[PDB]
Design a protein around this ligand. Structure first.
Ligand SMILES: CN1CCN(c2ccc(C(=O)Nc3n[nH]c4cn(C(=O)Cc5cccs5)cc34)cc2)CC1
Ligand SMILES: [Zn+2]
Length: 294
C-alpha cells in the first residue's frame, strides 16, 4: 500500500510538518494542508509516490518541475517554500491558496462581469510576465492552475509542463503532456515558445467573459481540429474592445499574437474599471460595483 506519513520531516532543515486536511488530487500527486510544528504556519503539501516515479523519464520531469518552481518568487506565482524526500515519497511545500482555483469559480459563476475579468486577467498576465522575463514558459495555463488565496489573489501553479528557454530564438519541439488550452503550433508539432502562454491566456479570457471555452466539443480530437482551423466565434454581447484582444491572442500564427508585455497596455485594461480588490461574495454572487451602500 505505502501510506503517507502523518508527520513529514525534512532532515536538512530540521522542520516538521503535521499532515492536515486533504485538498485534492492532480496527476500522480495528492495535496494536503500541512502545518509547521514550531511556527504553526500552514502550507499546501504536494506529495507524489516514488512508486509512480520508477522510470527515469518520469523522475526527470518531477526534478525539472522542482528546479523551475524553486527558482521563482512572485506575488502571482504559487510560492515555493521547500522540498525534501524519504524512500517512498517526494514532498514539496507550497503556498496555501485557501479559495481553490479559477476552475471552481467558473463552474459556480460561469461568465464573470467585465471588471472581474480585468482584475483576474491582470494578475495572470503579471505572473506570466514574470515567468517570461525569467525565460520560463508555463505551457499549461488553465483555470485549474490559477489558484486563489484568501484575498482572491491569483497564483499560477503546476509547473509540471513548464520549460526553460536556454538560448535566444529556441523553438521547443516537444511537449510531453496534454495542455488544456493547447496552442495550434503544438498540435501540429511545428515548434513553439513563449507565445503558447499568450494563446492560453486568450482562451482563459474568452472562458471568463463568455462562460465557456472557445473550442469546446464532445471529442477532444475534434477540438484539436477546430484549433487548427481557428474555428471559434465570439458572441455579440461581448464588448468589441474585449473581443478585439481575444482575437489578437487567438491567432494561429504565433508571431501575430501580442507578447505578454504588450497586454496590460491594451485598451481592454486601460479604458475600463479594474477593481483594487474583490470581496469574498464574488465567489458566489455577481458584483455590481456600486458607488455607495444603499
Ligand atoms: C478541505 N477543503 C477542500 C476544498 N477546499 C480546497 C481545495 C483545494 C485547495 C488547494 O488545492 N489549494 C492549493 N494551494 N496551493 C496549491 C498548489 N496546488 C497544486 O500545485 C495542485 C496540486 C498539488 C498536488 C496535487 S494537485 C493546489 C494548491 C484549497 C482548498 C477547501 C478545503
Ligand atoms: Zn515524455
Amino acid at each position: 500500500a505505502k501510506e503517507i506519513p502523518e508527520v513529514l520531516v525534512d532532515p536538512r532543515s530540521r522542520r516538521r510538518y503535521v499532515r492536515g486536511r486533504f485538498l485534492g488530487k492532480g496527476g500522480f500527486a495528492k495535496c494536503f494542508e500541512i502545518s509547521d510544528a514550531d511556527t504553526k504556519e500552514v502550507f499546501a503539501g504536494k506529495i507524489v509516490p516514488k512508486s509512480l516515479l520508477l522510470k527515469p523519464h518520469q523522475r526527470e520531469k518531477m526534478s525539472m518541475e522542482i528546479s523551475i518552481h524553486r527558482s521563482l518568487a512572485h506575488q502571482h506565482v504559487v510560492g515555493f517554500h521547500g522540498f525534501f524526500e524519504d524512500n517512498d515519497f517526494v514532498f514539496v511545500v507550497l503556498e496555501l491558496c485557501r479559495r481553490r482555483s479559477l476552475l471552481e469559480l467558473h463552474k459556480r459563476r460561469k461568465a464573470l462581469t467585465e471588471p472581474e475579468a480585468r482584475y483576474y486577467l491582470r494578475q495572470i498576465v503579471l505572473g506570466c510576465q514574470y515567468l517570461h522575463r525569467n525565460r520560463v514558459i508555463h505551457r499549461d495555463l488553465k483555470l485549474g492552475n490559477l489558484f486563489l488565496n484568501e484575498d482572491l489573489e491569483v497564483k499560477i501553479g503546476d509547473f509540471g509542463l513548464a520549460t526553460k528557454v536556454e538560448y535566444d530564438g529556441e523553438r521547443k519541439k516537444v511537449l510531453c503532456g496534454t495542455p488544456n488550452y493547447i496552442a495550434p503550433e503544438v498540435l501540429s508539432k511545428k515548434g513553439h515558445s513563449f507565445e503558447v502562454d499568450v494563446w492560453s491566456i486568450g482562451c482563459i479570457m474568452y472562458t471568463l467573459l463568455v462562460g465557456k471555452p472557445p473550442f469546446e466539443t464532445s471529442c477532444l480530437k475534434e477540438t484539436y481540429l477546430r484549433i487548427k482551423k481557428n474555428e471559434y466565434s465570439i458572441p455579440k454581447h461581448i464588448n468589441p474592445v474585449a473581443a478585439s484582444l481575444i482575437q489578437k491572442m487567438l491567432q494561429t500564427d504565433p508571431t501575430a499574437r501580442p507578447t505578454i508585455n504588450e497586454l496590460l497596455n491594451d485598451e481592454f485594461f486601460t479604458s475600463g474599471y479594474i477593481p483594487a480588490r474583490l470581496p469574498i461574495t464574488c465567489l458566489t454572487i455577481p458584483p455590481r460595483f456600486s458607488i455607495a451602500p444603499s
